[PDB]
Each structure stands twice: as C-alpha cells, then as structure tokens.
Design a protein around this ligand. Structure first.
Ligand SMILES: C[C@H]1CCCN1Cc1nc2ccc(NC(=O)c3ccc4c(cnn4C)c3)cc2[nH]1
Length: 143
C-alpha cells in the first residue's frame, strides 16, 4: 500500500589491448575499467564513490573515484579478479554494492577486449530522500 521499489542500472566494463611494444617495465597491456550509467542517466545522483581494488602488486591498489568518470586506466602484465565497490548516497542499508569484476586481457594474437556487464539494482522502500536521488539519476518505480 506504501510499498515502493526503484530500479536503476549500472554498467561495469573494461577495455584491454596488447601494446605494439611492451613498456620498459614489461607491461604488455593497456587496460581501462569503469562504472557508468546508461546514456542520459546520471548515477552521480546516488553514487557517493566507486572503489576499484587492483591486484596487491599495483601502487595504491585501492583506487577511488568520488566523481565521474568512475574508471581506472592502467598498464599491466596479466588479468585478475577486481572487487569493485559502489557506495551510495544512502543514509540506511544498503550503503554499497560489491561486484567481483573479471578483468581479463587478450592473449597475444587476439583482438582487443571491449566488455560490458549490465547490473540492475532493485532498491525496496528507499527513504524519501534516497528515492529522490535514484529517480534524479534515471531510476524507475515498479510494483
Ligand atoms: C601506468 C602506471 C600508473 C601507476 C602504475 N601504472 C604502471 C603499473 N605499475 C604496476 C605494478 C604492478 C602491476 N601488476 C600487474 O600487472 C599484475 C597483474 C596480474 C597479476 C600480477 C601478479 N599476479 N597476477 C594475477 C601482477 C601492474 C602495474 N602497472
């Protein structure tokens, strides 16, 4: 009767390509990982920050974006599993969502990687305040 659900969408993704020539440090690959909304949505209305947890070998592996673009650009030698936390401008639970992101590179001879992973978040009965932030960002009421 006073029940209420807001869906929003997140796109996580990454690009990777073999450098024509490795770096001095033997980095064979360029890559880029990101969190964005669909086109014409503004996830910054409900997203406080995004944290990208790189392999422990990276300098400052806890990479934070407090505003768009939410992305890391790097070079490296191998793929890994990257925890990505999306923190919300939410007073209550849930405050964040954690994704296990497969950052995989192209094996030499294979063309560049260009992957997208679409995530639908369903917020049940958000506070009036946080409901407003979700709708500002291009979220939708359901149910
Ligand atoms: C462009 C500049 C901006 C600051 C730093 N970056 C250069 C730069 N500094 C690095 C330090 C470490 C690594 N490590 C890896 O590439 C890496 C990936 C997967 C791995 C391992 C070991 N096991 N597995 C599964 C290592 C990459 C780096 N790239």
């Amino acid at each position: 009767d006073n029940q209420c659900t807001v869906q929003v969408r997140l796109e996580l993704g990454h690009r990777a390509q073999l450098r024509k020539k490795p770096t001095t440090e033997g980095f064979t690959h360029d890559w880029m990982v990101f969190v964005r909304g669909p086109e014409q949505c503004d996830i910054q209305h409900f997203v406080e920050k995004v944290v990208f947890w790189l392999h422990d070998s990276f300098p400052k592996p806890r990479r934070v974006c407090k505003e768009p673009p939410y992305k890391v650009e790097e070079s490296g030698y191998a793929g890994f599993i990257m925890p990505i936390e999306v923190h919300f401008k939410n007073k209550e639970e849930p405050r964040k969502v954690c994704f296990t992101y497969d950052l995989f590179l192209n094996l030499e001879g294979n063309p560049p990687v260009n992957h997208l992973r679409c995530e639908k978040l369903t917020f049940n009965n958000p506070t009036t305040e946080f409901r407003y932030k979700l709708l500002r960002a291009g979220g939708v009421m359901v149910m």
